[PDB]
Amino acid sequence: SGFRKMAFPSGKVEGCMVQVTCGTTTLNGLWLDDVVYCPRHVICTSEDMLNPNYEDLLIRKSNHNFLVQAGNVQLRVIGHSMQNCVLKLKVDTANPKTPKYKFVRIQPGQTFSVLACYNGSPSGVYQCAMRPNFTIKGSFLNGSCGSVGFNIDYDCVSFCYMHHMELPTGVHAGTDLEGNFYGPFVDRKTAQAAGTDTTITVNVLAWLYAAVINGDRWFLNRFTTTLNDFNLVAMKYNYEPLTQDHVDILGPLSAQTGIAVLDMCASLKELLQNGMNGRTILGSALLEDEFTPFDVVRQCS
C-alpha cells in the first residue's frame, strides 16, 4: 500500500555527472564513454546571450577553453562539437561508470526523474512530467544547467531531458540529448512565452484509480458517459482530450478495480462540473496530473 511521488534510483546517472567550465561559466555535463554532453550556451558570455551566433563562438574556441572535472580529476578535452543546442566534448578517458543507455525524446504527460546537480555534484532526485506546453515544473537554482532527466528500464538508462533555462514564469525548458528543445524555445535571451498550459486527463484518471486502490472511493457514481461526451466537458475546463489509446492504456487498473474506464470518466466529469464539494482525494483538494498510468501500476500492483 501507499502511493507517493517516487523517482528512479539515481546511482547510474550520478556516476556520469561532471563539471564543465568555459571561461566564467560553470554548469553540469553528462559523461558517457569518451563524450561529455552539456548545454552549448556554456560558450556564451552575458553579452553573447542576447544574440548568440553559436557557429562563430565555437569556431573561435579551442579544446583548452573547456575545463572538465570528474570530482577533482581534470579530463583532457581533445575535441569539441555542436549537435543542435548541446555541446559534445571528446575527452581522453572513457567513463568506466558509463551504464547501458539510450537517448529518447518524450511527449507531454510522460514523467521522468531529474537529478539536479551543481558543479558536477548531485543535490537531489525528484519526479516531474513534460507539460502539454513543452515545459517542466522543476526545482532548479543557478548552475543547475546540464542536469538531466531519465527513466530506468531494468539496467538501461533512457536519458530524455537536459536542463537549459528558466522562463520568467519560473518554469523550466530544455532539450533531449540530441540538443532539440522541447517546445518553441531557443538558447537566446529573448522574450519566450511559456504558452498556456492544460491538465493531463489520462494522468488525472490514473491518479483516481490509485485513489480507489488505496480505499478512497467517495467520488465513484452510477452515472456514465461516452468518450465524445467526456471530451466536450474536458475542453471547457482546459483538460486534454482522451483518446481510445489513453482508454486502452488504463485497461489494467480498470481490470484491477473492475471500474470501466468510461465510468471513471463519469466520476471525473462530475468533479469538473460540481467540484469536490469540500472533499479531498488522497488528501488533495486538487486533481493530480503528473502521475502516469505506468507510474500508478508500478507502485499500486
From Swiss-Prot:
Please tell me the species this chain comes from. Severe acute respiratory syndrome coronavirus 2 (2019-nCoV)
Q: What is this protein called?
A: 3C-like proteinase nsp5
Report the subcellular localization.
Host cytoplasm; Host Golgi apparatus; Host nucleus
Task: Give the quaternary structure.
Answer: 3CL-PRO exists as monomer and homodimer. Only the homodimer shows catalytic activity. Interacts with host FBXO22; this interaction promotes the proteasomal degradation of nsp5.
Q: Give the top-rank taxon of the lineage listed in the UniProt record for this protein.
A: Viruses
Cross-linked residues, Glycyl lysine isopeptide (Lys-Gly) (interchain with G-Cter in ubiquitin): 5, 90
Q: Which reaction does it catalyse?
A: TSAVLQ-|-SGFRK-NH2 and SGVTFQ-|-GKFKK the two peptides corresponding to the two self-cleavage sites of the SARS 3C-like proteinase are the two most reactive peptide substrates. The enzyme exhibits a strong preference for substrates containing Gln at P1 position and Leu at P2 position
Lineage at the top is: Viruses, Riboviria, Orthornavirae, Pisuviricota, Pisoniviricetes
The free-text function statement in the UniProt record for this protein reads: Cleaves the C-terminus of replicase polyprotein at 11 sites. Recognizes substrates containing the core sequence [ILMVF]-Q-|-[SGACN]. Cleaves and inactivates human TRMT1, preventing tRNA guanine(26)-dimethylation of tRNAs. May cleave human NLRP1 in lung epithelial cells, thereby activating the NLRP1 inflammasome pathway. May cleave human GSDMD, triggering alternative GSDME-mediated epithelial cell death upon activation of the NLRP1 inflammasome, which may enhance the release interleukins 1B, 6, 16 and 18. Also able to bind an ADP-ribose-1''-phosphate (ADRP).
Task: Tell me the ranges covered by the Peptidase C30 domain, including all copies.
Answer: 1-301
Result after altering residue 142 to A: Does not affect ability to cleave and inactivate human TRMT1
What regulates this protein's activity? Inhibited by pyridone-containing alpha-ketoamides compounds 13a and 13b. In turn, alpha-ketoamide 13b (tert-butyl (1-((S)-1-(((S)-4-(benzylamino)-3,4-dioxo-1-((S)-2-oxopyrrolidin-3-yl)butan-2-yl)amino)-3-cyclopropyl-1-oxopropan-2-yl)-2-oxo-1,2-dihydropyridin-3-yl)carbamate) inhibits SARS-CoV-2 replication in human lung cells. Inhibited ex vivo by michael acceptor inhibitor N3. Inhibited ex vivo by compound 11a and 11b.
Effect of changing residue 145 to A: reported as:
Complete loss of 3C-like proteinase nsp5 cleavage
* Cytoplasmic side, ranges: 1-301
Query: Active-site positions, per UniProt?
Result: 41, 145
